[PDB]
Ligand binder design. Sequence first.
Ligand SMILES: N[C@@H](CCC(=O)N[C@@H](CS)C(=O)NCC(=O)O)C(=O)O
Ligand SMILES: N[C@@H](CCC(=O)N[C@@H](CS)C(=O)NCC(=O)O)C(=O)O
Lengths: 184, 187
Amino acid sequence: KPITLYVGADYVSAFAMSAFVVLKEKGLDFEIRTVDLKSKQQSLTRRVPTLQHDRFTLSESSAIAEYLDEVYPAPHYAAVLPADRETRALARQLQAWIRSDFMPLGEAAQLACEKLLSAADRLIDDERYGVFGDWCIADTDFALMLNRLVACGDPVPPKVLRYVERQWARPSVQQWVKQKRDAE
Amino acid sequence: SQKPITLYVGADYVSAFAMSAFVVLKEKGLDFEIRTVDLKSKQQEVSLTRRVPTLQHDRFTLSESSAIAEYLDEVYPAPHYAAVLPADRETRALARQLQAWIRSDFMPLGEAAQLACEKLLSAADRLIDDERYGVFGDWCIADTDFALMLNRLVACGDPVPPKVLRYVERQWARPSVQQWVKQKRDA
Ligand SMILES: N[C@@H](CCC(=O)N[C@@H](CS)C(=O)NCC(=O)O)C(=O)O
Ligand SMILES: N[C@@H](CCC(=O)N[C@@H](CS)C(=O)NCC(=O)O)C(=O)O
């Protein structure tokens, strides 16, 4: 089915990358259309990314991953969400947390940092490729968010740095960076 | 006998998101204890994010109210239990969209406030119809979330179509929400 991914003209939204990665990790074909923010976005929410699946349209990268996982499920397709029920819960928590907290990224800023660091330290481990074993779309979201530790003030454990490096190295993510470079 | 369930909420019963999780449990007819978290500044053990709500299901703990809704819907599904998410795949994706949007936009609620006000009213005008009880027809948890958020229209400066006033009223009148204002009241 014809897919079109609506994306920011400058290719910098972590949430547009998310949706892009989902489509790539699944091996699905899609056109990219761009929305020049400042201010052409004025999709129900009037934000990017927006997904066009045949006639059906959908915004919010989290909803987008959820929906493509249902329409294109394992085994025939790669699952971007965990298969285990409560691990699926945890990836959902992680996605929704990342999307609705850490706004300060200063008392407020220092607190976000302290929560982000604390979570990195408790969720990441060298023995596991993602935080829950196999990569899921939450890993890509978490890595992207963890790049803000660079602006905080407390020492970051190397296991966290390795995780961010590991996750950025994924071919799906790398196609995004190449897509971004081809302009121009 | 079902697994024990506990819900962590703010001690003031104010959170729109605490209320959301509470509504899911109540719709499904599940037993649960309620435990409270103060501020300042007790959210700083059972919660990775240090925000309310947090759900404890038997031994499993889970924060983020939308993730809670998705999880309770999987553990206690239709038809054995009332569903809080739409059955239709496309419609399910739209409720998921609405939940996330609510939880990640509308911060200004000015000029960024003006834009959020505008986006809110336009969504309300497009999704609410007197012929449909919820935005999708049958009630889902997205409707409680929407109705709570729509109460911010009161602080804006555009006239509000009575059809959305009715929706908000409709949604606040569910026995599950009322159970919440009753539990809150008892404090
Ligand atoms: N939670 C949303 C985030 C969407 C979002 O924040 N999009 C930004 C990307 S910069 C945007 O469209 N900003 C333009 C605007 O809101 O006017 C998701 O994951 O899709
Ligand atoms: N997306 C989250 C939002 C949760 C949230 O914002 N909780 C507030 C209650 S108003 C909170 O815990 N504030 C304390 C804090 O963030 O420090 C959800 O649905 O659970």
